[PDB]
Amino acid sequence: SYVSPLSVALGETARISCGRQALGSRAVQWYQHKPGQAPILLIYNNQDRPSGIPERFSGTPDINFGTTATLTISGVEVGDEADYYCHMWDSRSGFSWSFGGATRLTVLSQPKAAPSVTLFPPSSEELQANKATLVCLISDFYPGAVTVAWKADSSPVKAGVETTTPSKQSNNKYAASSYLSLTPEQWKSHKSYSCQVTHEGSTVEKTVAPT
Amino acid sequence: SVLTQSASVSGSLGQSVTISCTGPNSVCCSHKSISWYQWPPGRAPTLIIYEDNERAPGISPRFSGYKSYWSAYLTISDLRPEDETTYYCCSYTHNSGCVFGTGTKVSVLGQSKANPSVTLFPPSSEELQANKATLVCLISDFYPGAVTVAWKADSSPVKAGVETTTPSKQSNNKYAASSYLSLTPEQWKSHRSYSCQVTHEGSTVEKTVAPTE
Amino acid sequence: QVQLQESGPGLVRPSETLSVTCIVSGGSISNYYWTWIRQSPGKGLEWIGYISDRETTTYNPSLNSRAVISRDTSKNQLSLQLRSVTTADTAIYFCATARRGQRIYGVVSFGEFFYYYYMDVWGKGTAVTVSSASTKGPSVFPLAPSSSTSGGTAALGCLVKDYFPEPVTVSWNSGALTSGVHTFPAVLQSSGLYSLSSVVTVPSSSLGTQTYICNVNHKPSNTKVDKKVEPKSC
Amino acid sequence: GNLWVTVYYGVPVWKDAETTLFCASDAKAYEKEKHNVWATHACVPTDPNPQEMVLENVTENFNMWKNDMVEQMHTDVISLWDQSLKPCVKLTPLCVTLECRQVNTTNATNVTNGEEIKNCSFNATTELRDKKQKVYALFYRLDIVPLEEERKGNSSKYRLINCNTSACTQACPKVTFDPIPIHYCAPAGYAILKCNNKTFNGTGPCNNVSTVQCTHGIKPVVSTQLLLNGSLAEGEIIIRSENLTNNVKTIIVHLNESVEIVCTRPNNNTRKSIRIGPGQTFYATGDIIGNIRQAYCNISKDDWIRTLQRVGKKLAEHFPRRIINFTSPAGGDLEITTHSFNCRGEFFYCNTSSLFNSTYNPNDTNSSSNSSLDITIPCRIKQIINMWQRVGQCMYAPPIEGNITCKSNITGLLLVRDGGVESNETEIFRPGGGDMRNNWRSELYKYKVVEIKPLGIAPTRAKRRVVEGGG
Amino acid sequence: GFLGAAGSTMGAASITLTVQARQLLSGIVQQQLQLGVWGIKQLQTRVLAIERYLKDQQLLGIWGCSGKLICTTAVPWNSSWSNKSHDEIWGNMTWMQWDREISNYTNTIYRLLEDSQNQQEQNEKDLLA
Amino acid sequence: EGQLVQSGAELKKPGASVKISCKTSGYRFNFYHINWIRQTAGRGPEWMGWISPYSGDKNLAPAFQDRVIMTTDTEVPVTSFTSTGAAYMEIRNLKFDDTGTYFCAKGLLRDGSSTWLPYLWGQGTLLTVSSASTKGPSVFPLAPSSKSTSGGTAALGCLVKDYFPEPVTVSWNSGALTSGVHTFPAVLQSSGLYSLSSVVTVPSSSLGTQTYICNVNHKPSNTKVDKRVEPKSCDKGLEV
Ligand SMILES: *[C@@H]1O[C@H](CO)[C@@H](O[C@@H]2O[C@H](CO)[C@@H](O[C@@H]3O[C@H](CO[C@H]4O[C@H](CO[C@H]5O[C@H](CO)[C@@H](O)[C@H](O)[C@@H]5O[C@H]5O[C@H](CO)[C@@H](O)[C@H](O)[C@@H]5O)[C@@H](O)[C@H](O[C@H]5O[C@H](CO)[C@@H](O)[C@H](O)[C@@H]5O)[C@@H]4O)[C@@H](O)[C@H](O[C@H]4O[C@H](CO)[C@@H](O)[C@H](O)[C@@H]4O[C@H]4O[C@H](CO)[C@@H](O)[C@H](O)[C@@H]4O[C@H]4O[C@H](CO)[C@@H](O)[C@H](O)[C@@H]4O)[C@@H]3O)[C@H](O)[C@H]2NC(C)=O)[C@H](O)[C@H]1NC(C)=O
Ligand SMILES: *[C@@H]1O[C@H](CO)[C@@H](O[C@@H]2O[C@H](CO)[C@@H](O[C@@H]3O[C@H](CO[C@H]4O[C@H](CO[C@H]5O[C@H](CO)[C@@H](O)[C@H](O)[C@@H]5O)[C@@H](O)[C@H](O[C@H]5O[C@H](CO)[C@@H](O)[C@H](O)[C@@H]5O)[C@@H]4O)[C@@H](O)[C@H](O[C@H]4O[C@H](CO)[C@@H](O)[C@H](O)[C@@H]4O)[C@@H]3O)[C@H](O)[C@H]2NC(C)=O)[C@H](O)[C@H]1NC(C)=O
Ligand SMILES: *[C@@H]1O[C@H](CO)[C@@H](O[C@@H]2O[C@H](CO)[C@@H](O[C@@H]3O[C@H](CO[C@H]4O[C@H](CO)[C@@H](O)[C@H](O[C@H]5O[C@H](CO)[C@@H](O)[C@H](O)[C@@H]5O)[C@@H]4O)[C@@H](O)[C@H](O[C@H]4O[C@H](CO)[C@@H](O)[C@H](O)[C@@H]4O)[C@@H]3O)[C@H](O)[C@H]2NC(C)=O)[C@H](O)[C@H]1NC(C)=O
Ligand SMILES: *[C@@H]1O[C@H](CO)[C@@H](O[C@@H]2O[C@H](CO)[C@@H](O[C@@H]3O[C@H](CO)[C@@H](O)[C@H](O)[C@@H]3O)[C@H](O)[C@H]2NC(C)=O)[C@H](O)[C@H]1NC(C)=O
Ligand SMILES: *[C@@H]1O[C@H](CO)[C@@H](O[C@@H]2O[C@H](CO)[C@@H](O)[C@H](O)[C@H]2NC(C)=O)[C@H](O)[C@H]1NC(C)=O
Ligand SMILES: *[C@@H]1O[C@H](CO)[C@@H](O[C@@H]2O[C@H](CO)[C@@H](O)[C@H](O)[C@H]2NC(C)=O)[C@H](O)[C@H]1NC(C)=O
Ligand SMILES: *[C@@H]1O[C@H](CO)[C@@H](O[C@@H]2O[C@H](CO)[C@@H](O)[C@H](O)[C@H]2NC(C)=O)[C@H](O)[C@H]1NC(C)=O
Ligand SMILES: *[C@@H]1O[C@H](CO)[C@@H](O[C@@H]2O[C@H](CO)[C@@H](O)[C@H](O)[C@H]2NC(C)=O)[C@H](O)[C@H]1NC(C)=O
Ligand SMILES: *[C@@H]1O[C@H](CO)[C@@H](O[C@@H]2O[C@H](CO)[C@@H](O)[C@H](O)[C@H]2NC(C)=O)[C@H](O)[C@H]1NC(C)=O
Ligand SMILES: *[C@@H]1O[C@H](CO)[C@@H](O[C@@H]2O[C@H](CO)[C@@H](O)[C@H](O)[C@H]2NC(C)=O)[C@H](O)[C@H]1NC(C)=O
Ligand SMILES: *[C@@H]1O[C@H](CO)[C@@H](O)[C@H](O)[C@H]1NC(C)=O
Ligand SMILES: *[C@@H]1O[C@H](CO)[C@@H](O)[C@H](O)[C@H]1NC(C)=O
Ligand SMILES: *[C@@H]1O[C@H](CO)[C@@H](O)[C@H](O)[C@H]1NC(C)=O
Ligand SMILES: *[C@@H]1O[C@H](CO)[C@@H](O)[C@H](O)[C@H]1NC(C)=O
Ligand SMILES: *[C@@H]1O[C@H](CO)[C@@H](O)[C@H](O)[C@H]1NC(C)=O
């Protein structure tokens, strides 16, 4: 129906279970899939891993029937945070088309990162096109839990705010952008506009004003 | 044969006869057993007495044995025409083999004499291609077993290539014999008559066939 | 050894024929098996079917009624078609190289062994959406430098406003600029249009006339609009 | 020379008579698992040694086909079977309609068979009479016949195979079927004569003859086509038949060196005890743990093909006919066309088509080593059997937990001629064991029953002091 | 040994006659179980064997040969039974073939055996003692 | 009531060895000894030895102890008290004084004082030791002759001339006519060859319905001569 979660501390070992355990002799596959990228199989035959896959991954064989196929990852890295699929093929159940239910891994104990905020006012060409949008870009923060608020001088805007849900970038940190739609008269009117980004207990605020 | 028997002995028809068989004490019947066999010439012998007195299975009570400390005796009561043959004794222990005797020819006197049956056979035309010419004078059913044969060519005695056989006993208790005259085709074709003369004790018979015939 | 390159339209109307192409380079198509797997938002990845080197098709039971997989002999590329698509078929489509697998657990003469498949090599995957909405070319408005942080560095940007559908590929001077580039995820405004922003952090000293030009490419709308960035003025 | 009859009491004189012998099996102990059908309460422990007395200057007629020890061992096997089936739980209430379904099996794709295990559910009585309980159990297809439909691999309606011919009685879990060494002993006034000729045919006079108080260790092994765990013929490979020219009766083959046959059931099964009455706990087959394989038997192809070669030559001896063609049986009855036997509880039925598929010429007309490619035999399994002839009523072989593996040494064959073809054009042979007694004859050929007559009236040269003689 | 002189001549067989008479019944007194109808055949054999003993003991009972194995009789030998001598019986024939040669009669030899003596002896024992 | 059949007559050169057989039937071969006794023309009977088939016992005479080896095979049973065996006597370095008849005999008793005593003798084996090679016989027809004019009996035969060594076996109609047959002993011709004749006396009326074929067998030379007697006679006494 949906994806099952899991959390493993940084630097420790991760034993990821496989749903619907086999009913006989089995040849399972362990696939690694990060959102937006190509899936990679960590394991293709319980024990075997192709060249290029690190030695930290290992799968339990079926030398004695009754063992649950577990994916063991020794020394969890920040890059190991992804979705893991368990493709189950056994001698009892027939053709197994569907992959296993995804297992969302989350790495705990990561160092927190303060949000880097860059606020950009509506450009001159956009204002010339009778449109305005304040662009508050948040990058390089951890964890991905931020709340964006907008301020005119000191009054909340509360309207016309479009916010992106955070997403992890190449730095293994999170990033999210926030757009505030305004007409050129509203942007030209007030003294200064401010973007407040609340991250953990902190709140980083950046202010821009018309020229 | 150190175990010596009587050379010949005779008894009357319907009477009895005794056969002796003795030898040195190292072989004789002080610590030995005596067996009696009937061994006709040209046949297989037949056990008639075994272990001194007891007779072989199925033997008539006419035969009997009597063993002394120095000799063994075989009595054959009620003599029959088939009893006229040779008999042998054997001195044996439980382990050592038979020690045969010299032999005894038993004659049964007081019987009726028989007439000789003589037939002279000329050499066939196939023998003259060999080439030989042998006259075959056959005699049979005569009694007793003694004859005297003589050949003749054109009423003249012949003494070359004569070969006569000793008398043999027929199954009819009579005797038979044969004589042969070997000749070359010249002597064959050189006379007018060939004759076989069989002479007995009571009657002399002659049969003649011509060579040219 | 083998490299794959997906290529598709990006938007197909409902109840139509979704056609995607997969280009091969390393080896011939008559040497390996080939699988197609789609991944839709809110769900997992779905194996839809595979084709052998012997041109024998096999499909998933749910899509067997609407899926067709083929391979081209002259050109090293395989094709995927899906008739009568709806808004549920919107997904990122991957093609993969499938190797065979023989799992023996008993006597071969009796049988007692089953075949399985694993796909080691994948492609980048092409995102495909399906709806009655029309195409939309992205507007480009450059974000002038703030001239931002303390002495040392500053940030400039390129605004890609109101387009449809995903995705939009952004570069800077056709790849001449690479270090410090960050392309933020687009937002879906309530109008039904996406909007992304790109930023680069360059030193404030290198702002005489280096002229950072941002190149926007959106193949669904055939629009390839570039834009220059100049500092402030006024 | 005066003979008188005299009585001698104890003269070695015997005559052929048929009297009932008795059992004697050497002392074998087990404190936990008791009640051996062929041993416990069926036989008795014997002495440490049954002496064999060689009889000199004796040549004794033997006849294995007119023997009475075989006709006694047959009825003793059947009677021990029915005695084993008396106190156990019977399966009269197991005659309820069955809803059977197919069992999970992965797609396939040479040609072979497959004993479709059926997962059957049914309403069954419980410890209470008025109340019931729907339970499931795994049954082999051969133990069940349908009523309607079948056709889909979905549900339909089924019926146990026995529930009309005769009610069935489950086997006790305590009793064991393993054949134990059984010695047949003769009572007082009788004796057993043993023929010690190594190359002895079926019947006729035997030269080297002895007498014994009891026979040697004979294990009552029941089988078909292949007789195993028996004795080995010393010297030559022996062919024993009541009548070779008779096309109908069988022919027994006694081998000079046994051949290995290894039989395994690879299904790590499970046992599920369900109540079907007060104290009655019917044991059914639980779900098969692990893969779904079929039982089989491996036989060394080198030793088997050499054995069939030598048997082919021994058949070429008694037959100045033509090429010795070997085939499988004609077909029809499953228990006739299969090498059927037991392997600790489970009853195996093997298809020996790959074994009997040879043909050897008198001219030879026209090799090397091939490792040890053991000829594999697909062997199915039955749980409700009615063999031992119809006299022996059925029994539900209770499921055996875990996998099964049993070794065996085949020491002979049970062949049958074909006939119908032109004589000496081509001779055909088919395995089979249509009669139960032939399994015992192959071990009771070297024995005979005799009755002692100690009265001997013989004449001697001696008379008793008749009446008036004392003083 | 038991039946060890079955192929030997009647002279070497008549020596050991206690051996065939021992194992003709000797169910040992043990001095050191049964159940079911299947274990009744055993009993029926025992009884049967016992009868086999107590029948021969009965014949030897009416023949005046109770306690001894060998015994002489007052019945004379008949010439029609066999035409064999002493060395033609006790050193040429086994008890088997001899009993086969006499098997046409015996029953007459048995009637005379219980009639020619013990029917006349017991009559001439009340009239004597 | 057994049966001891010996091998056929044999010719051997001086210095060689020969092995005579003695196959039995109709009795338990292991129950009686096998005796070998020879008879020569000059010395009469002479017991050579006996051998036990059961125990392997052998007793040889001191004269034949140096050049005679006796063996026996194991009996092949037929019934419970009958079997078939064979005995063999191998004699080496033959001389002319060894020429004669050889008999194997079956023992009288199994146990007693005369167990080995020869009782059931065989037909005999004629052994000839000579330097002259074998010579086959020449058979010539003996035409019928008159034996009785009133009784109507004639005598017809066959002449066996020049053969070596002895003997020669004669039959009529392949053994289907042994009544009234008389075979005369062999003569010793001047050249050393043997010759005999076989005659039969038959009614003269049986000429068209009775076959007259004298079967002559000389097995030493491996030759057999089956002759049809010529039924054309020149005797006038018979034609009356
Ligand atoms: C009566 O007679 C009957 C027959 O006549 C007889 O039936 C026999 O039964 C037995 C079992 O009872 C059967 O034995 C089985 O055999 C299976 C197959 O084994 C063969 O193949 C493997 C694999 O070889 C491929 O891979 C290697 C490595 O990549 C390559 O180098 C090879 O070239 C080959 O690759 C080719 O083939 C591929 C397809 O398979 C192609 O894709 C590829 O392109 C290539 O073309 C070999 O390794 C085997 O060799 C081994 O055994 C031989 C002796 O036979 C040794 O000499 C040799 O040194 C090796 O040790 C062999 O050639 C086995 O897979 C099977 O064992 C698995 O299953 C059991 C039960 O489920 C498990 O308990 C067990 O643990 C095994 O699982 C392992 O393997 C799976 C799949 O790989 C893994 O997923 C799993 O995790 C586990 O991994 C283990 O092994 C790994 C190494 O492989 C190791 O790294 C891991 O760490 C882990 O330890 C079983 O043994 C036999 O086949 C039957 N006979 C026949 C003819 O079928 C019956 O018993 C008789 N009855 C009696 C006697 O009573
Ligand atoms: C099965 O049937 C067979 C056949 O029917 C039967 O065998 C017969 O058994 C009987 C005994 O019951 C035998 O008869 C006895 O023979 C005794 C032999 O005496 C000795 O002499 C033998 C000859 O030796 C001579 O030659 C050698 C070498 O040339 C020389 O050195 C000697 O000095 C001598 O000159 C000899 O072969 C024989 O050997 C036997 O015994 C030795 C041990 O002593 C053993 O080593 C051998 O292997 C062999 O077994 C022996 O040494 C004879 O003594 C005996 O006479 C006694 O009894 C009679 C009454 O019966 C008394 O009157 C007499 O005084 C003696 O006390 C008796 O004659 C017969 O020969 C057998 N026949 C055959 C064909 O084998 C089996 O016994 C039967 N078996 C069964 C179980 O039924
Ligand atoms: C032809 O001949 C072959 C050769 O004998 C026959 O093969 C035999 O089959 C029978 C079944 O029909 C087997 O008996 C069963 O064996 C199993 C397996 O466990 C036994 O064997 C193990 C090795 O294979 C052994 O390790 C086991 O225990 C040993 O160690 C313990 C101590 O730890 C010791 O106490 C033992 O004595 C052993 O030394 C064990 O023996 C077993 O599970 C079965 O047990 C059940 O039945 C017995 C009956 O006595 C009972 O006592 C138990 O309580 C339990 O109820 C049973 O013994 C036999 O093992 C096979 N032979 C061999 C050599 O393995 C073949 O069957 C014959 N053919 C035919 C047609 O009969
Ligand atoms: C008739 O059969 C009997 C038995 O079947 C044969 O007796 C057997 O004879 C052999 C040797 O001839 C004996 O073998 C020997 O055994 C001893 C141990 O006792 C051993 O030390 C030797 O090395 C040898 O192996 C065998 O034991 C014996 N049988 C019995 C039961 O004692 C007899 O030989 C046969 N007769 C013929 C003529 O073959
Ligand atoms: C088994 O072999 C025996 C011989 O050892 C056979 O017995 C003889 O067989 C031949 C023909 O082969 C017959 O002529 C004889 O009459 C048989 N003799 C006896 C005493 O039976 C026996 O026939 C063979 N068995 C079979 C079934 O052929
Ligand atoms: C006992 O075994 C021997 C073989 O060791 C048998 O002897 C053979 O018997 C047959 C007749 O059945 C003959 O054709 C053979 O020539 C014999 N061989 C030898 C080597 O003698 C003997 O027959 C057997 N006795 C039986 C079966 O009673
Ligand atoms: C006995 O079996 C052999 C082998 O199965 C038969 O030989 C086969 O004959 C057929 C003719 O119908 C050929 O097509 C096969 O090639 C032969 N087999 C082999 C291995 O060459 C033989 O015909 C059988 N005997 C009879 C009487 O049918
Ligand atoms: C036993 O197995 C053999 C093969 O393992 C079966 O023989 C097959 O029979 C069918 C029809 O009779 C043929 O179409 C196949 O070609 C045969 N197989 C082979 C390998 O020749 C046989 O039928 C089986 N026994 C039973 C009773 O079904
Ligand atoms: C008997 O064995 C022979 C030899 O293996 C089998 O003959 C083969 O049959 C197949 C087709 O059935 C042919 O393709 C092969 O060429 C044959 N020979 C060999 C050497 O494989 C035959 O099928 C077997 N018969 C059975 C099992 O019933
Ligand atoms: C099956 O046969 C094998 C060999 O053919 C038997 O193994 C023998 O066992 C005995 C012990 O009784 C050993 O003395 C031998 O050395 C073994 N043979 C070998 C080659 O090692 C095995 O016992 C037989 N199984 C049975 C009769 O059940
Ligand atoms: C064997 O059977 C044939 C006919 O099938 C019959 O003529 C013969 O007498 C039988 N032989 C025996 C010993 O039963
Ligand atoms: C019989 O067995 C012996 C010894 O094991 C062996 O040498 C011989 O080859 C075998 N012969 C046959 C025909 O089985
Ligand atoms: C086999 O039988 C045929 C006809 O039945 C016959 O012609 C042939 O001679 C026989 N061959 C033998 C007996 O060896
Ligand atoms: C002997 O037996 C015959 C029968 O053959 C009988 O007539 C006769 O009376 C018997 N004699 C005696 C004395 O019993
Ligand atoms: C006694 O032995 C001889 C010679 O072996 C035999 O002919 C005869 O049948 C035997 N039995 C007798 C005479 O009762």
Author numbering:
A (entry chain L): 6 to 67, 67A, 67B, 67C, 68 to 95, 95A, 95B, 95C, ...
B (entry chain E): 2 to 214
C (entry chain H): 1 to 82, 82A, 82B, 82C, 83 to 100, 100A, 100B, 100C, ...
D (entry chain G): 32 to 140, 147 to 186, 186A, 186B, 186C, 186D, 187 to 309, 312 to 321, ...
E (entry chain B): 521 to 552, 566 to 662
F (entry chain D): 1 to 52, 52A, 53 to 72, 72A, 72B, 72C, 72D, 72E, ...
According to the publication:
Aided by these design advances, we derived the crystal structure of the disulfide-stabilized (I201C-A433C) 16055 NFL TD CC (T569G) trimer in complex with the broadly neutralizing antibodies (bNAbs), PGT124 and 35O22, at 3.9 Å resolution, providing a high-resolution Env structure derived from a subtype C primary isolate. Overall, the structure of 16055 NFL TD CC (T569G) in complex with PGT124 and 35O22 closely resembles those of soluble subtype A BG505 SOSIP.664, subtype G X1193.c1 SOSIP.664, and full-length native subtype B JRFL Env ΔCT Env trimers (Garces et al., 2015, Julien et al., 2013, Lee et al., 2016, Pancera et al., 2014, Stewart-Jones et al., 2016). Another difference in these NFL trimers is the flexible (G4S)2 linker connecting gp120 to gp41 that eliminates the need for furin cleavage (Sharma et al., 2015), for which only the first three glycine residues are visible in the NFL structure. Although residues 553–565 of the gp41 HR1N were not resolved in the 16055 structure, L566, Q567, L568, and G569 downstream of the I559P substitution were interpretable and offer some insights into how the 569 glycine substitution contributed to the generation of stable clade C Env NFL trimers. The helix-disrupting capacity of the T569G mutation disfavors the extension of the HR1C helix, helping HR1N remain in its flexible coil form observed in the SOSIP structures. At least one sugar moiety for 22 glycans was visible in the electron density maps out of the 29 potential N-linked glycosylation sites (PNGS) in the 16055 Env sequence. In the 16055 crystal structure, PGT124 penetrates into a cleft surrounded by glycans N156, N301, and N332. The antibody mostly avoids the N-glycans at residues N156 and N301 but makes contact with N332 and the conserved V3 324G(N/D)IR327 motif as previously demonstrated for PGT124 in the context of a gp120 core (Garces et al., 2014).
For HIV, the Env is the sole neutralization target for antibodies on the viral surface and thus is of major interest for vaccine design. For decades, the generation of soluble mimics of Env was challenging due to its inherent metastability, in part because of the non-covalent association of the Env subunits, gp120 and gp41, due to furin cleavage of the precursor gp160 during natural infection to attain its fusion-active conformation (Berger et al., 1991, Moore et al., 1990). In the past year, we reported the engineering of an uncleaved soluble Env mimic, the native, flexibly linked (NFL) trimer. This design includes the I559P mutation present in SOSIP trimers but uses an extended flexible linker to replace the furin cleavage site between the two Env subunits, rendering these trimers both covalently linked and cleavage independent (Sharma et al., 2015).
